Design a protein around this nucleic acid. Structure first.
Ligand SMILES: [Cl-]
Ligand SMILES: [Cl-]
Ligand SMILES: [Cl-]
Ligand SMILES: [Cl-]
Ligand SMILES: [K+]
Ligand SMILES: [Mg+2]
Ligand SMILES: [Mg+2]
Ligand SMILES: [Mg+2]
Ligand SMILES: [Mg+2]
Ligand SMILES: [Mg+2]
Ligand SMILES: [Mg+2]
Ligand SMILES: [Mg+2]
Ligand SMILES: [Mg+2]
Ligand SMILES: [Mg+2]
Ligand SMILES: [Mg+2]
Ligand SMILES: [Mg+2]
Ligand SMILES: [Mg+2]
Ligand SMILES: [Mg+2]
Ligand SMILES: [Mg+2]
Ligand SMILES: [Mg+2]
Ligand SMILES: [Mg+2]
Ligand SMILES: [Mg+2]
Ligand SMILES: [Mg+2]
Ligand code: NA
Ligand code: NA
Ligand code: NA
Ligand code: NA
Ligand code: NA
Ligand code: NA
Ligand code: NA
Ligand code: NA
Ligand code: NA
Ligand code: NA
Lengths: 92, 56, 237, 194
RNA sequence: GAAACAUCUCAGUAUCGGGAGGAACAGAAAACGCAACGUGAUGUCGUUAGUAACCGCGAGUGAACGCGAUACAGCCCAAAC
RNA sequence: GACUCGUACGGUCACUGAAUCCUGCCCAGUGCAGGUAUCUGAACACCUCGUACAAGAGGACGAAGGACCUGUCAACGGCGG
RNA sequence: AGCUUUACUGCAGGCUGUCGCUGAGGACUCUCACUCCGGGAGGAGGACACCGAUAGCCGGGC
């Protein structure tokens, strides 16, 4: 489906309607320093490694909408529930 | 030839004999080793924990 | 599964061992301080149980009596020599250097003084080709060009018993008798005739190997069977 | 002023530099040709020996012992094992090489008792440790106010029970506080979890 | 056992190798860290506590300091000269 | 340590199974083996960023192996609409 | 439970890079460790190989 790159809507921060810009959430990069990272190294040894021996699940036929809504005046963002969408394209 | 009765007739070989060390008839005269006390294999007397129940 | 036959071999049990106690002599070149003065006389010609080829008993000047890898043409009474100055005739042993190129040799040493390693079976021979102050090139019976230290001792002539392979065994019994004098388990049961548990080729309702026969060089023992690291197979092309 | 000993000590802080380096490159050649346990008249590291209890006296013995380097020489399982217990290559023994050396020495000298030991280097495939042993029966020692303690019966086979210095360290008994919950007073009384 | 099972659990159990004594082992702080102007070698008992901690964060696993007791005991080298 | 008191006319590993007449075509897949400009390819050391250090992120180089190419069926096998 | 395999997960083993042993002057010489041949003298090889450690690939042989 199509979707406006910018449009007015409520800003939970300003607490008043303003023009927001919509961007797809780009994945942040991992540091490899989180607790889970240390447990992987610590708990992996000889033979099977339990949970750390598992591999990536799979895919749902269609993914939900993963967006960031940025307030055009205060510059802060907020998230919303997403909805299943085969494809999402912005207008302008 | 049956592995049973008919094969029992050739058994006239002497192996286990009275042991010089423990007195039991377990000294294998071909191996020169007592299956009971270990004489001929060990200076220490043959003994295992599995010869009795674990908690005893 | 169970260990395959090739694995039972390594354990060195009776069945797989050679009847060593029935063997005559560990044929090796004599050791001469130097000079070459060493010489002896062929006293007899015996049969060598370990090689199915004749061997010669020799008495040396210093009283030493020892069997020697006999080349073709050596007979009782003959006098053989061993050393740098040894004459250049069949039966004499001298370093590859003192040997004239183009001459057939046998019982060639790999490392000087090791007593001889190459070309020692019935009728075979090596071919000394090139000389040098450093390398003496010999062409082993396999057809390979072996670079060797000119100091490596060798014996002139081809090994005795040539043509032994020309006559077929004809019957199992004959093979049996020969096999009994070697370190070998015989007869041979085909893998494809065994049970899966016994061989990687065993199993099936009919006889055929499970997978392809050419096995990687890296295959572990217990699995390295069939055509080991074959560069090719068949006869075509 | 510095003791002469201090120089031996300071030299061994870096066995790969200076004269000591050349000394080692030389000795090890003879060592690699000696046996498993070789009695030696004088300690190669005098400061270390004296520091550990050594004394140029009757009943005091020293021997160099060589042990192979690396992990456990282990046989792969011949019956069912869960993946966790199917290892061979990475398994290591819980007793350090220096302790293996002390035991091999004590067995070579059945009448003697291990007093202490120290490292004297290693090459690519083995380590050498010099072990100091004591004759608990010689009066030269029974009458020594500093060593006679080793003569008591309860000191019999002290090395095989880990009462040696390297033993007690290897048993995780160094620390007296945090971290020694499962080690003191003994590994066995703590259910073998140390 | 985890109602399968691989880490986990059974368990450092069974069993095996080596060795001491009448008891062993431990032990006079490179400790503790109720953080203190505080405690003061070590075992053990009671408690702390199924607490903290671990764990396909599943099933399960699981201390310590301190405190109340028992009994108390503190020393010898290496080196300097 | 066996083979081995052995050395290619050897001995190992496999298939077929006396003699006689013979044994066609197929290397795409799989296997084995050889080669390989380029692509891919771990760790150590090295460079950049980061951290008064460290974790960590990236880069450069690139072994065997793989991609790619070739040989091979008395190698696994195939020989249709 | 035995057996199979391009089932899942691992473990031996083989190949390969790297670190240690290991030294002198992306290709090269040397000798002194180390290895092998030689009864010895000495010869071959040589910082490689072996061995210890680690990494990648193959890996129903288990
Ligand atoms: Cl989206
Ligand atoms: Cl034959
Ligand atoms: Cl002792
Ligand atoms: Cl306190
Ligand atoms: K289990
Ligand atoms: Mg693992
Ligand atoms: Mg029966
Ligand atoms: Mg021989
Ligand atoms: Mg034939
Ligand atoms: Mg036989
Ligand atoms: Mg057959
Ligand atoms: Mg059958
Ligand atoms: Mg099989
Ligand atoms: Mg058939
Ligand atoms: Mg067939
Ligand atoms: Mg269960
Ligand atoms: Mg106790
Ligand atoms: Mg569950
Ligand atoms: Mg537990
Ligand atoms: Mg505490
Ligand atoms: Mg089953
Ligand atoms: Mg040798
Ligand atoms: Mg299986
Ligand atoms: Na851990
Ligand atoms: Na089959
Ligand atoms: Na002793
Ligand atoms: Na522990
Ligand atoms: Na169950
Ligand atoms: Na089950
Ligand atoms: Na777990
Ligand atoms: Na093909
Ligand atoms: Na092919
Ligand atoms: Na079964």
């Amino acid at each position: 489906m199509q979707m406006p790159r910018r449009f007015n809507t409520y800003c939970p921060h300003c607490n008043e309607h303003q023009e927001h810009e919509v961007e797809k959430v780009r994945s942040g990069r991992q540091t490899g320093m989180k607790w889970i990272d240390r447990q992987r190294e610590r708990n992996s040894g000889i033979g099977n490694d339990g949970k750390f021996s598992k591999v990536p699940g799979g895919d749902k036929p269609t993914k939900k909408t993963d967006l960031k809504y940025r307030c055009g005046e205060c510059g802060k963002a907020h998230l919303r529930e997403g909805w299943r969408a085969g494809r999402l394209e912005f207008q302008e | 030839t049956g592995a049973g009765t008919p094969s029992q007739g050739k058994k006239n070989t002497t192996t286990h004999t009275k042991c010089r060390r423990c007195g039991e008839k377990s000294y294998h005269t071909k191996k020169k080793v007592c299956s009971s006390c270990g004489f001929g294999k060990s200076a220490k007397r043959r003994d295992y924990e599995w010869q009795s129940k674990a908690g005893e | 599964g169970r260990r395959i036959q090739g694995q039972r071999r390594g354990r060195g049990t009776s069945t797989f061992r050679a009847p060593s106690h029935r063997y005559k002599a560990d044929l090796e070149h004599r050791k001469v301080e130097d000079g070459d003065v060493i010489a002896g006389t062929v006293v007899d010609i015996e049969h060598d149980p370990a090689r199915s080829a004749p061997v010669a008993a020799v008495e040396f000047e210093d009283g030493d009596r020892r069997l020697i890898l006999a080349p073709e043409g050596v007979g009782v009474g003959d006098e053989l020599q061993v050393g740098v100055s040894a004459e250049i005739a069949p039966g004499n042993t001298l370093p590859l250097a003192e040997i004239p190129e183009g001459v057939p040799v046998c019982n060639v040493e790999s490392s000087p003084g090791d007593g001889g390693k190459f070309a020692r079976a019935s009728g075979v021979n090596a071919q000394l080709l090139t000389h040098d102050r450093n390398v003496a090139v010999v062409k082993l019976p396999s057809g390979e060009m072996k670079r060797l230290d000119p100091q490596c001792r060798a014996t002139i002539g081809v090994v005795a018993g040539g043509g032994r392979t020309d006559k077929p065994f004809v019957k199992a019994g004959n093979k049996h008798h020969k096999m009994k004098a070697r370190g070998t388990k015989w007869p041979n049961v085909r893998g494809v005739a065994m049970n899966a548990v016994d061989h990687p080729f065993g199993g099936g309702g009919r006889q055929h190997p499970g997978k392809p026969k050419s096995i990687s060089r890296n295959a572990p023992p217990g699995r390295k069977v069939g055509d080991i690291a074959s560069k090719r197979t068949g006869r075509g092309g | 002023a510095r003791s002469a000993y201090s120089y031996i000590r300071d030299a061994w802080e870096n066995p790969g530099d200076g004269q000591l380096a050349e000394l080692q490159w030389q000795r090890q050649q003879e060592w690699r040709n000696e046996g498993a346990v070789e009695r030696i008249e004088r300690p190669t590291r005098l400061d270390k020996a004296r520091s550990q209890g050594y004394k140029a006296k009757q009943g005091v013995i020293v021997a160099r012992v060589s042990v192979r380097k690396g992990s456990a020489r282990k046989r792969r399982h011949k019956a069912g094992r869960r993946s966790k217990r199917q290892g061979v290559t990475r398994i290591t023994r819980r007793k350090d090489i220096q302790r293996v050396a002390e035991e091999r020495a004590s067995r070579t000298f059945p009448n003697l008792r291990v007093l202490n030991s120290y490292s004297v280097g290693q090459d690519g495939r083995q380590k050498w440790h010099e072990v100091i042993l004591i004759d608990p029966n010689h009066p030269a020692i029974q009458n020594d106010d500093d060593l006679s303690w080793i003569c008591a019966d309860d000191q019999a086979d002290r090395v095989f029970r880990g009462l040696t210095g390297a033993g007690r360290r290897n048993r995780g008994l160094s620390g007296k506080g945090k971290g020694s919950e499962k080690t003191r007073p003994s590994l066995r009384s703590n259910g073998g979890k140390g």
